[model samples]
Target chain A: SSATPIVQFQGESNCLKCFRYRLNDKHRHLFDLISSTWHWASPKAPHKHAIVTVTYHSEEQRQQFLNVVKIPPTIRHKLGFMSMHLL
Target chain B: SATPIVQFQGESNCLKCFRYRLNDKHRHLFDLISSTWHWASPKAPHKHAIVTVTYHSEEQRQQFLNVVKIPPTIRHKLGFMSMHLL
Candidate 1:
């Protein structure tokens, strides 16, 4: 169980990137809430698509976050993610 | 004129280091996104507090990547272990 935990999600245009961007004081509590986790958004080949990459410090930590983190659709829409969160 | 900008959150000390290290030649490249960056408070950053940064376009971001690649000592001092992009 030494694998570093990572998760990826698809988003539109700069949406996924903005989700990661906005977390910088613009909506930083969420960043702080998952302080142990690291994430970034990358532009994809489809020319306006993006992908968000999230990683945890440990496998158990990832499980803990996945079991608790909540990203409501309303917030998702506002964040430009256009999708649900937390599985 | 923009709704949002990029932020380079990192240890407070390193941000202050990068803030002062930006040279005049490429400084304006970043302003294409927003105004020049400065602390919100005189005593801001608060020791390792997260910091924000901005950029204009992808090319400019690339340019920024180029700029930081220099000053290996500065990057080392600022603790910029890796490029933070979004």
Candidate 2:
């Protein structure tokens, strides 16, 4: 089997949402990438919308994370695209 | 009853969808911002990850769009923070 990959996901606007992590890592990458990107980009104004990263160990984590973020109903179909690899 | 929805826009990591039209005049500006997000710091050793989102108004757009200088060590800390978060 291949070694655990440091999976990364790119979201809207090509932002680097998840940096690198295995299956067991905490969900901090999601929150950190959001807060860090926001704080870094929006010192003068609060971002009305942001495309943050969410990591999952499996389908359960994926579903749970999406639910936690309150992703809108319309684009729910795109969740599968979240598993994209980082290059 | 509310008018039929003709225009829609949604933005999130890995997704940008719009069901309605964007004015031609505004499209040029939008591409500039997208280009900026993709190539703001060309010569830097590390590619800067920009979070871009579209708003409903010019005020909101300009309010959220701007860049500031960050020290190199501090930049490393930003990455380190993500590592620590993981």
lDDT of 1 by residue, B1-86 (tens): 22123444445466545555553345654532211222222223322333233454556656776666443322221111112222
Q: Could you tell me how far off, in angstroms, the CA of residue B2 lies in candidate 1 after the best superposition?
A: 10
Query: Best candidate, TM-score-wise?
Result: 1
**Model 2: share of real contacts kept:** 0.00
- What tens digits encode model 2's per-residue C-alpha lDDT throughout B1-86? 11111111123222121111122223422211221122112222224443332343454344323322222222111111112111
TM-score of each: 0.30, 0.23
Choose the strongest candidate by lDDT. Answer: 1
Please write out the lDDT profile of model 2 over residues A1-87, one tens digit for every residue: 111112223333223333212211444433312212222132222222333233334555455555554333222122322211221
Classified by CAPRI criteria, candidate 2 counts as: incorrect
Poorest 10 consecutive residues by lDDT, candidate 1 chain B: B75-84
Q: For candidate 2, give the lDDT of residue A54.
A: 34
